[PDB]
């Protein structure tokens, strides 16, 4: 234990598994035991373990990962992307305080926020592990930066904790005490986010998860999916008319509504139709027609399918002789008359 030299290339002195206690200092070291080392040797780094920063621990290099990185990650170009890795270090600190959050949340039962906390912290670690790799496009990184700081200060909110500023480039360049009225306006922006988020979290999390399908009280348009179809066919013309009129009554943040339909005769799909694009809409009314050509003799059995499109499947619709509860009526009304346009009411 001689030739010990100061260094600063040891900020990430990282273990592997339970280290063994051949020396009196060490114990069964956990997975993530960073060591703020103060002395250097060829294959053995003894330095301040984070668990007890006043107790030395002597640790082999074959247990340490050589990590030249500092808390700053742009000096050595260590940022896999510039201006971000400050986020990962502050997220690790925020998890280090999530340590005591879980440690103390059991002595007493506030289990509702804790269940949604299990959900939200699973989500948080999910985003962190995604952003471990820099394969994401930069706009994904900006959005992830925003949402990570949102979760962090939302935790700081319900715990009665301090606040965070400079929602960009690592939450650093504003809190670096560079000015003061920029500081006051940033604090006002952040606490306005607090007020917005507290009112909205109260509103959704309490009323809008109960004001809905479970409670008979009046609500807005939600996941009771309602869409209207107008199917026509003429015997002589041997053509098929299809009105994707309008599909109102959509659910939460109904993304990029668009509609589809296939002309399917068997397992493979023969023909398809394309319709225009529009943005987020609760009540979207394209009312567009594309006509597939099928004759009466082949009209006895086909696959008339349609599906509202968001990015996640809202539902599926398949109107054909082997129908179910709410499309047999439209089947009978479409087959009874071959001339007029009949508007139908149907859930999926």
């Amino acid at each position: 234990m001689a030739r010990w030299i100061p260094t600063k290339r040891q900020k990430y002195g990282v273990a592997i598994y339970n280290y063994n206690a051949s020396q009196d200092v060490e114990l069964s070291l956990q997975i993530g035991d960073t060591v703020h080392i103060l002395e250097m040797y060829e294959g053995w780094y003894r330095g301040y373990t984070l668990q007890n920063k006043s107790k030395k621990g002597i640790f082999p290099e074959t247990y340490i990962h050589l990590k030249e990185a500092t808390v700053e990650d742009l000096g050595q170009h260590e940022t896999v992307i510039p201006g971000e890795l400050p986020l990962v270090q502050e997220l690790t600190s925020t998890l280090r305080e999530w340590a005591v959050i879980w440690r103390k949340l059991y002595v007493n039962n506030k289990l509702t926020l804790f269940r949604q906390l299990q959900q939200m912290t699973y989500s948080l670690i999910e985003w962190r592990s995604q952003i471990l790799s820099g394969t994401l496009p930069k706009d994904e990184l900006a959005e992830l930066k925003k949402k990570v700081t949102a979760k962090i200060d939302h935790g700081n909110r319900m715990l009665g904790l301090d606040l965070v500023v400079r929602d960009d480039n690592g939450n650093i360049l504003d809190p670096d005490e560079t000015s003061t009225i920029a500081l006051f306006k940033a604090h006002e922006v952040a606490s306005k986010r607090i007020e917005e988020k507290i009112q909205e979290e109260k509103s959704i999390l309490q009323n809008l998860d109960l004001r809905g399908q479970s409670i008979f009280s009046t609500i807005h348009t939600y996941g009771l999916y309602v869409n209207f179809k107008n199917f026509v066919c003429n015997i002589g013309e041997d053509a098929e008319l299809f009105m994707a009129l309008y599909d109102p009554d959509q659910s939460t943040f109904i993304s990029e509504n668009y509609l589809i339909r296939w002309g399917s005769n068997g397992m493979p799909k023969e023909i398809e139709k394309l319709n225009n694009l529009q943005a987020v809409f609760t009540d979207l009314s394209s009312m567009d027609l594309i006509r597939p050509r099928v004759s009466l003799v082949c009209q006895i059995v086909r696959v008339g399918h349609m599906e509202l499109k968001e990015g996640k499947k809202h539902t599926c619709g398949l109107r054909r002789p082997f129908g179910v509860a709410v499309m047999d009526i439209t089947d009978i009304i479409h087959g009874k008359v071959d001339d007029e346009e009949k508007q139908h009411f149907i859930p999926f």
Binding site: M1, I5, Y17, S28, G32, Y63, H65, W98, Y106
Partner: protein, 198 residues
Amino acid sequence: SRPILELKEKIQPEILELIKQQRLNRLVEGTCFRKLNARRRQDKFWYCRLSPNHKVLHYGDLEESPQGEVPHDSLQDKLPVADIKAVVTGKDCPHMKEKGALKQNKEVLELAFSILYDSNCQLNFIAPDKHEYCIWTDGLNALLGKDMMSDLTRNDLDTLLSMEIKLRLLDLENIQIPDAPPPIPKEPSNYDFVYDCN
């Protein structure tokens, strides 16, 4: 995750101790308990509240309190646990083995736990359903310095310990975790600190 789970199962100390200390608090906070065989103008709600010193239980025959527990000195204020044998569970109840008029219902078989003491008398309690029955059996076996026997205990145990490992894998990510024990290359013999300590 074989070395990971081996680490997880190797380090018990903190996790189960603190669980039992929350369980002590659960016994302390108290609730409305249940008696035996109340049909002819007999009460059905009472309390057996632990001391904040976690040694003695205040209990006895109490009233119909819609709010819950009544803080005061009750009928039977002592339950000494320096000498308790055990708390039998299942069909080992000298009160559930009645053969005359105090026979117990079959559907309430999952409320069975008897704090046996004095080797001749019994204090026999009844729970509403399974979960908090297992909660008080957690408390009871925690009064013995032994293992826990609750469904809630296994659920919390797994989520907690998995989370703790999950909250430990932070500094290793992007890099694999070797399982083979890394060597111990030789060291200098002298304690000569070239760099000053502290």
